[PDB]
Amino acid sequence: MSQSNRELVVDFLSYKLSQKGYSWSQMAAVKQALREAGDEFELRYRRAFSDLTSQLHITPGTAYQSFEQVVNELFRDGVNWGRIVAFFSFGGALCVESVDKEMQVLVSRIAAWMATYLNDHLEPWIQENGGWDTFVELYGN
Amino acid sequence: MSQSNRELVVDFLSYKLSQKGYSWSQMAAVKQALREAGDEFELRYRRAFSDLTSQLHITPGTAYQSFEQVVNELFRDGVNWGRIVAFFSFGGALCVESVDKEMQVLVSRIAAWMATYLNDHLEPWIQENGGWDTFVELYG
Ligand SMILES: O=C(NCc1ccccc1)c1csc(N/N=C2\CCCc3ccc(-c4ccc(OCCc5ccccc5)c(C(=O)O)n4)cc32)n1
Numbered sequence: 322m323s324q325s326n327r328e329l330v331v332d333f334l335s336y337k338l339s340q341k342g343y344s345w346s347q348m349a350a351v352k353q354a355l356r357e358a359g360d361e362f363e364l365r366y367r368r369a370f371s372d373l374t375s376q377l378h379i380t381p382g383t384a385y386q387s388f389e390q391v392v393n394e395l396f397r398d399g400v401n402w403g404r405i406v407a408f409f410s411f412g413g414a415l416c417v418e419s420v421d422k423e424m425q426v427l428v429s430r431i432a433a434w435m436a437t438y439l440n441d442h443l444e445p446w447i448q449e450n451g452g453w454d455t456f457v458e459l460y461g462n
Numbered sequence: 463m464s465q466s467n468r469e470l471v472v473d474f475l476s477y478k479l480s481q482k483g484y485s486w487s488q489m490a491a492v493k494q495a496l497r498e499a500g501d502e503f504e505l506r507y508r509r510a511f512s513d514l515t516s517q518l519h520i521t522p523g524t525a526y527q528s529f530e531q532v533v534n535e536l537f538r539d540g541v542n543w544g545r546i547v548a549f550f551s552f553g554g555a556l557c558v559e560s561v562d563k564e565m566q567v568l569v570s571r572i573a574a575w576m577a578t579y580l581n582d583h584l585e586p587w588i589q590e591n592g593g594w595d596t597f598v599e600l601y602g
Protein backbone atom coordinates (compact mmCIF):
# COMPACT_ATOMS: atom_id res chain seq x y z
CA MET A 322 0.00 0.00 0.00
CA SER A 323 2.87 2.40 1.00
CA GLN A 324 4.54 1.88 -2.46
CA SER A 325 1.14 2.57 -4.18
CA ASN A 326 0.75 5.81 -2.07
CA ARG A 327 4.29 6.95 -3.18
CA GLU A 328 3.38 6.06 -6.83
CA LEU A 329 0.18 8.28 -6.51
CA VAL A 330 2.24 11.24 -5.15
CA VAL A 331 4.97 10.88 -7.85
CA ASP A 332 2.30 10.64 -10.63
CA PHE A 333 0.35 13.64 -9.26
CA LEU A 334 3.43 15.96 -8.88
CA SER A 335 4.97 14.91 -12.29
CA TYR A 336 1.56 15.50 -14.02
CA LYS A 337 1.11 18.91 -12.28
CA LEU A 338 4.66 20.21 -13.12
CA SER A 339 4.42 18.91 -16.76
CA GLN A 340 0.97 20.59 -17.09
CA LYS A 341 2.67 23.95 -16.23
CA GLY A 342 5.65 23.25 -18.59
CA TYR A 343 8.11 23.15 -15.63
CA SER A 344 11.40 21.17 -15.92
CA TRP A 345 12.45 20.15 -12.34
CA SER A 346 15.24 17.48 -12.85
CA GLN A 347 17.59 16.14 -15.58
CA MET A 348 15.72 12.76 -15.41
CA ALA A 349 12.30 14.50 -15.95
CA ALA A 350 13.81 16.57 -18.83
CA VAL A 351 15.23 13.37 -20.54
CA LYS A 352 11.88 11.55 -20.20
CA GLN A 353 9.95 14.59 -21.60
CA ALA A 354 12.45 14.94 -24.53
CA LEU A 355 12.06 11.18 -25.34
CA ARG A 356 8.19 11.30 -25.17
CA GLU A 357 8.01 14.29 -27.53
CA ALA A 358 10.71 12.90 -29.95
CA GLY A 359 8.81 9.57 -30.15
CA ASP A 360 5.52 11.49 -30.87
CA GLU A 361 7.23 13.52 -33.70
CA PHE A 362 9.01 10.38 -35.07
CA GLU A 363 5.73 8.34 -35.06
CA LEU A 364 3.67 11.21 -36.66
CA ARG A 365 5.95 12.27 -39.54
CA TYR A 366 8.97 9.90 -40.12
CA ARG A 367 8.21 6.26 -39.06
CA ARG A 368 6.01 5.42 -42.12
CA ALA A 369 9.04 6.04 -44.49
CA PHE A 370 10.91 3.06 -42.88
CA SER A 371 10.29 -0.75 -43.03
CA ASP A 372 8.04 -1.78 -40.09
CA LEU A 373 10.40 -3.63 -37.65
CA THR A 374 7.37 -5.29 -35.88
CA SER A 375 6.85 -7.17 -39.24
CA GLN A 376 10.37 -8.69 -38.83
CA LEU A 377 9.87 -9.79 -35.16
CA HIS A 378 6.18 -11.05 -35.26
CA ILE A 379 6.43 -11.13 -31.43
CA THR A 380 4.80 -14.16 -29.71
CA PRO A 381 4.82 -15.37 -26.07
CA GLY A 382 7.61 -17.77 -27.34
CA THR A 383 9.87 -14.89 -28.63
CA ALA A 384 13.28 -14.69 -26.78
CA TYR A 385 15.47 -11.58 -26.06
CA GLN A 386 17.98 -12.67 -28.79
CA SER A 387 15.18 -12.52 -31.47
CA PHE A 388 14.34 -8.93 -30.36
CA GLU A 389 18.09 -8.07 -30.36
CA GLN A 390 18.67 -9.41 -33.95
CA VAL A 391 15.69 -7.33 -35.30
CA VAL A 392 16.85 -4.14 -33.41
CA ASN A 393 20.41 -4.62 -34.87
CA GLU A 394 18.77 -3.91 -38.30
CA LEU A 395 17.80 -0.39 -36.98
CA PHE A 396 21.49 0.22 -36.02
CA ARG A 397 23.06 -1.65 -39.04
CA ASP A 398 24.62 1.74 -40.22
CA GLY A 399 25.55 2.87 -36.64
CA VAL A 400 23.97 4.76 -33.68
CA ASN A 401 22.52 8.34 -33.77
CA TRP A 402 19.95 10.04 -31.46
CA GLY A 403 17.19 9.65 -34.14
CA ARG A 404 17.66 5.84 -34.26
CA ILE A 405 17.69 5.71 -30.43
CA VAL A 406 14.29 7.57 -30.60
CA ALA A 407 13.14 5.02 -33.26
CA PHE A 408 14.25 2.17 -30.87
CA PHE A 409 11.95 3.52 -28.07
CA SER A 410 9.06 3.96 -30.60
CA PHE A 411 9.64 0.33 -31.82
CA GLY A 412 9.40 -0.94 -28.19
CA GLY A 413 6.25 1.19 -27.69
CA ALA A 414 4.76 -0.38 -30.87
CA LEU A 415 5.53 -3.97 -29.67
CA CYS A 416 3.68 -3.14 -26.38
CA VAL A 417 0.70 -1.52 -28.18
CA GLU A 418 0.37 -4.42 -30.70
CA SER A 419 0.75 -6.91 -27.78
CA VAL A 420 -2.20 -5.29 -25.92
CA ASP A 421 -4.18 -4.96 -29.25
CA LYS A 422 -3.75 -8.78 -29.63
CA GLU A 423 -4.87 -9.54 -25.99
CA MET A 424 -1.26 -10.51 -25.00
CA GLN A 425 -0.62 -7.81 -22.30
CA VAL A 426 1.60 -10.58 -20.63
CA LEU A 427 4.34 -9.57 -23.19
CA VAL A 428 4.56 -5.89 -22.02
CA SER A 429 6.92 -6.60 -19.03
CA ARG A 430 9.38 -8.76 -21.07
CA ILE A 431 9.42 -6.13 -23.91
CA ALA A 432 10.52 -3.54 -21.28
CA ALA A 433 13.31 -5.89 -20.00
CA TRP A 434 14.48 -6.53 -23.63
CA MET A 435 14.63 -2.74 -24.28
CA ALA A 436 16.64 -2.15 -21.03
CA THR A 437 19.00 -5.08 -21.91
CA TYR A 438 19.58 -3.73 -25.51
CA LEU A 439 20.21 -0.14 -24.23
CA ASN A 440 22.68 -1.35 -21.52
CA ASP A 441 24.49 -3.85 -23.83
CA HIS A 442 24.59 -2.00 -27.23
CA LEU A 443 23.74 1.73 -26.83
CA GLU A 444 25.16 2.76 -23.39
CA PRO A 445 28.78 3.09 -24.70
CA TRP A 446 27.57 5.27 -27.65
CA ILE A 447 25.34 7.34 -25.29
CA GLN A 448 28.29 8.07 -22.92
CA GLU A 449 30.70 8.75 -25.87
CA ASN A 450 28.26 11.41 -27.25
CA GLY A 451 27.70 13.37 -23.96
CA GLY A 452 25.09 11.10 -22.30
CA TRP A 453 21.34 11.85 -22.12
CA ASP A 454 22.32 15.47 -21.05
CA THR A 455 23.34 16.10 -24.73
CA PHE A 456 20.10 14.48 -26.00
CA VAL A 457 18.12 17.01 -23.86
CA GLU A 458 20.53 19.83 -24.90
CA LEU A 459 19.90 19.13 -28.67
CA TYR A 460 16.30 17.77 -28.63
CA GLY A 461 14.83 18.80 -25.20
CA ASN A 462 14.35 21.96 -23.01
CA MET B 463 20.05 12.69 -12.98
CA SER B 464 18.81 9.94 -15.40
CA GLN B 465 21.09 7.26 -13.87
CA SER B 466 18.76 4.39 -15.13
CA ASN B 467 18.11 3.16 -18.73
CA ARG B 468 15.20 0.99 -17.36
CA GLU B 469 13.45 4.11 -15.87
CA LEU B 470 13.50 5.79 -19.37
CA VAL B 471 12.07 2.55 -20.95
CA VAL B 472 9.25 2.20 -18.29
CA ASP B 473 8.41 5.96 -18.64
CA PHE B 474 8.28 5.88 -22.48
CA LEU B 475 6.21 2.61 -22.60
CA SER B 476 3.79 3.90 -19.88
CA TYR B 477 3.26 7.07 -22.01
CA LYS B 478 2.81 5.13 -25.32
CA LEU B 479 0.34 2.66 -23.72
CA SER B 480 -1.64 5.59 -22.14
CA GLN B 481 -2.02 7.23 -25.61
CA LYS B 482 -3.94 4.04 -26.74
CA GLY B 483 -6.17 3.87 -23.60
CA TYR B 484 -3.98 1.07 -22.11
CA SER B 485 -2.34 1.16 -18.60
CA TRP B 486 1.25 0.34 -17.47
CA SER B 487 0.28 0.00 -13.72
CA GLN B 488 -2.88 -1.20 -11.81
CA MET B 489 -3.03 2.26 -10.07
CA ALA B 490 -3.99 3.85 -13.48
CA ALA B 491 -7.71 4.54 -12.60
CA VAL B 492 -6.75 6.21 -9.25
CA LYS B 493 -3.99 8.35 -10.91
CA GLN B 494 -6.52 9.54 -13.59
CA ALA B 495 -9.26 10.29 -10.92
CA LEU B 496 -6.75 12.15 -8.67
CA ARG B 497 -5.31 14.26 -11.58
CA GLU B 498 -8.85 15.21 -12.80
CA ALA B 499 -10.14 15.91 -9.23
CA GLY B 500 -6.94 17.98 -8.65
CA ASP B 501 -7.52 20.01 -11.88
CA GLU B 502 -11.21 20.58 -10.97
CA PHE B 503 -10.39 21.60 -7.33
CA GLU B 504 -7.71 24.14 -8.44
CA LEU B 505 -9.93 25.78 -11.18
CA ARG B 506 -12.58 27.31 -8.77
CA TYR B 507 -13.31 25.40 -5.48
CA ARG B 508 -9.79 26.16 -4.04
CA ARG B 509 -10.29 29.98 -4.40
CA ALA B 510 -12.57 29.92 -1.25
CA PHE B 511 -9.73 28.81 1.12
CA SER B 512 -6.70 30.51 2.73
CA ASP B 513 -3.50 29.74 0.74
CA LEU B 514 -1.77 27.14 2.97
CA THR B 515 1.57 27.70 1.03
CA SER B 516 1.83 31.23 2.60
CA GLN B 517 2.54 29.42 5.97
CA LEU B 518 5.57 27.43 4.56
CA HIS B 519 8.97 28.70 3.26
CA ILE B 520 10.50 25.34 2.20
CA THR B 521 14.35 25.42 2.13
CA PRO B 522 16.92 22.58 2.42
CA GLY B 523 16.77 23.29 6.23
CA THR B 524 12.92 22.99 6.69
CA ALA B 525 11.95 19.97 8.90
CA TYR B 526 9.28 17.43 7.83
CA GLN B 527 7.49 18.53 11.10
CA SER B 528 6.94 22.12 9.74
CA PHE B 529 5.19 20.66 6.61
CA GLU B 530 3.20 18.13 8.75
CA GLN B 531 1.81 20.84 11.10
CA VAL B 532 0.72 23.10 8.15
CA VAL B 533 -0.92 20.14 6.27
CA ASN B 534 -2.76 19.14 9.53
CA GLU B 535 -4.84 22.39 9.09
CA LEU B 536 -6.56 20.78 6.00
CA PHE B 537 -7.83 17.95 8.25
CA ARG B 538 -8.64 20.05 11.35
CA ASP B 539 -12.41 19.20 10.93
CA GLY B 540 -11.86 15.58 9.70
CA VAL B 541 -10.52 13.73 6.62
CA ASN B 542 -12.81 13.54 3.54
CA TRP B 543 -11.92 12.75 -0.12
CA GLY B 544 -12.02 16.51 -1.06
CA ARG B 545 -9.41 17.40 1.61
CA ILE B 546 -7.24 14.46 0.37
CA VAL B 547 -7.60 15.96 -3.19
CA ALA B 548 -6.66 19.41 -1.72
CA PHE B 549 -3.60 17.80 -0.04
CA PHE B 550 -2.29 16.61 -3.47
CA SER B 551 -3.00 20.05 -5.06
CA PHE B 552 -1.20 21.69 -2.06
CA GLY B 553 1.78 19.36 -2.73
CA GLY B 554 1.72 20.40 -6.42
CA ALA B 555 1.66 24.12 -5.48
CA LEU B 556 4.66 23.59 -3.13
CA CYS B 557 6.63 21.93 -6.00
CA VAL B 558 5.86 24.82 -8.47
CA GLU B 559 7.01 27.41 -5.86
CA SER B 560 10.15 25.28 -5.15
CA VAL B 561 11.13 25.32 -8.89
CA ASP B 562 10.35 29.12 -9.10
CA LYS B 563 12.73 29.64 -6.08
CA GLU B 564 15.56 27.70 -7.91
CA MET B 565 15.13 24.79 -5.42
CA GLN B 566 14.15 22.20 -8.08
CA VAL B 567 15.98 19.54 -5.96
CA LEU B 568 13.38 19.90 -3.12
CA VAL B 569 10.56 18.52 -5.44
CA SER B 570 11.67 14.89 -4.61
CA ARG B 571 11.85 15.80 -0.86
CA ILE B 572 8.29 17.26 -1.02
CA ALA B 573 7.18 13.98 -2.74
CA ALA B 574 8.83 12.03 0.16
CA TRP B 575 7.07 14.26 2.78
CA MET B 576 3.65 13.82 1.05
CA ALA B 577 4.01 9.97 0.89
CA THR B 578 5.08 10.02 4.61
CA TYR B 579 2.06 12.19 5.61
CA LEU B 580 -0.26 10.01 3.44
CA ASN B 581 1.02 6.74 5.03
CA ASP B 582 0.90 8.03 8.69
CA HIS B 583 -2.14 10.40 8.90
CA LEU B 584 -4.44 9.42 5.97
CA GLU B 585 -3.94 5.66 5.21
CA PRO B 586 -6.11 4.56 8.20
CA TRP B 587 -9.05 6.85 7.12
CA ILE B 588 -8.59 5.65 3.47
CA GLN B 589 -8.78 1.91 4.51
CA GLU B 590 -11.83 2.60 6.77
CA ASN B 591 -13.73 4.43 3.91
CA GLY B 592 -13.47 1.75 1.15
CA GLY B 593 -9.91 2.51 -0.11
CA TRP B 594 -8.87 4.29 -3.35
CA ASP B 595 -11.39 2.26 -5.47
CA THR B 596 -14.24 4.08 -3.61
CA PHE B 597 -12.45 7.42 -4.35
CA VAL B 598 -12.44 6.30 -8.05
CA GLU B 599 -16.18 5.36 -7.87
CA LEU B 600 -16.98 8.89 -6.52
CA TYR B 601 -14.44 11.07 -8.47
CA GLY B 602 -13.46 8.83 -11.48
O1 LIG C 1 7.69 1.25 -34.48
C1 LIG C 1 8.10 0.73 -35.51
N1 LIG C 1 7.29 0.01 -36.31
C2 LIG C 1 5.91 -0.26 -35.94
C3 LIG C 1 4.97 0.67 -36.70
C4 LIG C 1 3.76 1.07 -36.11
C5 LIG C 1 2.85 1.89 -36.77
C6 LIG C 1 3.16 2.34 -38.05
C7 LIG C 1 4.35 1.98 -38.67
C8 LIG C 1 5.25 1.13 -37.99
C9 LIG C 1 9.49 1.06 -35.96
C10 LIG C 1 10.36 1.95 -35.31
S1 LIG C 1 11.72 2.09 -36.25
C11 LIG C 1 11.17 1.05 -37.43
N2 LIG C 1 11.83 0.74 -38.51
N3 LIG C 1 12.93 1.36 -38.81
C12 LIG C 1 13.99 0.88 -39.42
C13 LIG C 1 13.88 -0.30 -40.34
C14 LIG C 1 15.23 -1.02 -40.25
C15 LIG C 1 16.39 -0.15 -40.68
C16 LIG C 1 16.30 1.28 -40.21
C17 LIG C 1 17.41 2.10 -40.34
C18 LIG C 1 17.36 3.41 -39.88
C19 LIG C 1 16.22 3.88 -39.25
C20 LIG C 1 16.15 5.28 -38.75
C21 LIG C 1 15.13 5.70 -37.90
C22 LIG C 1 15.08 7.02 -37.48
C23 LIG C 1 16.05 7.92 -37.93
O2 LIG C 1 16.07 9.25 -37.58
C24 LIG C 1 14.93 9.74 -36.87
C25 LIG C 1 15.03 11.23 -36.78
C26 LIG C 1 13.91 11.75 -35.90
C27 LIG C 1 14.11 11.92 -34.53
C28 LIG C 1 13.08 12.41 -33.72
C29 LIG C 1 11.85 12.71 -34.29
C30 LIG C 1 11.66 12.56 -35.64
C31 LIG C 1 12.67 12.08 -36.45
C32 LIG C 1 17.03 7.45 -38.79
C33 LIG C 1 18.08 8.38 -39.28
O3 LIG C 1 17.71 9.62 -39.57
O4 LIG C 1 19.26 8.02 -39.41
N4 LIG C 1 17.06 6.17 -39.19
C34 LIG C 1 15.13 3.06 -39.12
C35 LIG C 1 15.17 1.76 -39.60
N5 LIG C 1 9.94 0.59 -37.17
Ligand SMILES: O=C(NCc1ccccc1)c1csc(N/N=C2\CCCc3ccc(-c4ccc(OCCc5ccccc5)c(C(=O)O)n4)cc32)n1
Binds near residue numbers: 507511513548
Ligand atom coordinates in the same frame (compact mmCIF):
# COMPACT_ATOMS: atom_id res chain seq x y z
O1 LIG D 1 -2.66 24.58 -3.30
C1 LIG D 1 -2.96 25.32 -2.37
N1 LIG D 1 -2.50 26.55 -2.24
C2 LIG D 1 -1.60 27.16 -3.20
C3 LIG D 1 -2.43 28.01 -4.18
C4 LIG D 1 -2.02 28.14 -5.50
C5 LIG D 1 -2.76 28.89 -6.41
C6 LIG D 1 -3.92 29.52 -6.01
C7 LIG D 1 -4.34 29.43 -4.70
C8 LIG D 1 -3.61 28.66 -3.78
C9 LIG D 1 -3.94 24.82 -1.38
C10 LIG D 1 -4.60 23.56 -1.41
S1 LIG D 1 -5.61 23.62 -0.10
C11 LIG D 1 -5.22 25.12 0.44
N2 LIG D 1 -5.79 25.62 1.51
N3 LIG D 1 -6.86 25.01 1.99
C12 LIG D 1 -7.25 24.98 3.25
C13 LIG D 1 -6.89 26.09 4.19
C14 LIG D 1 -6.80 25.50 5.59
C15 LIG D 1 -8.12 24.89 6.04
C16 LIG D 1 -8.77 24.05 4.97
C17 LIG D 1 -9.86 23.25 5.32
C18 LIG D 1 -10.56 22.55 4.36
C19 LIG D 1 -10.16 22.64 3.02
C20 LIG D 1 -10.90 21.87 2.02
C21 LIG D 1 -10.33 21.53 0.79
C22 LIG D 1 -11.10 20.78 -0.11
C23 LIG D 1 -12.38 20.39 0.24
O2 LIG D 1 -13.22 19.68 -0.56
C24 LIG D 1 -12.85 19.69 -1.95
C25 LIG D 1 -13.99 19.11 -2.77
C26 LIG D 1 -13.64 19.02 -4.25
C27 LIG D 1 -13.18 17.83 -4.81
C28 LIG D 1 -12.86 17.74 -6.17
C29 LIG D 1 -13.03 18.86 -6.98
C30 LIG D 1 -13.52 20.04 -6.42
C31 LIG D 1 -13.82 20.12 -5.05
C32 LIG D 1 -12.88 20.76 1.47
C33 LIG D 1 -14.25 20.33 1.88
O3 LIG D 1 -15.32 20.68 1.17
O4 LIG D 1 -14.32 19.60 2.84
N4 LIG D 1 -12.15 21.47 2.33
C34 LIG D 1 -9.08 23.44 2.67
C35 LIG D 1 -8.40 24.13 3.65
N5 LIG D 1 -4.31 25.67 -0.35
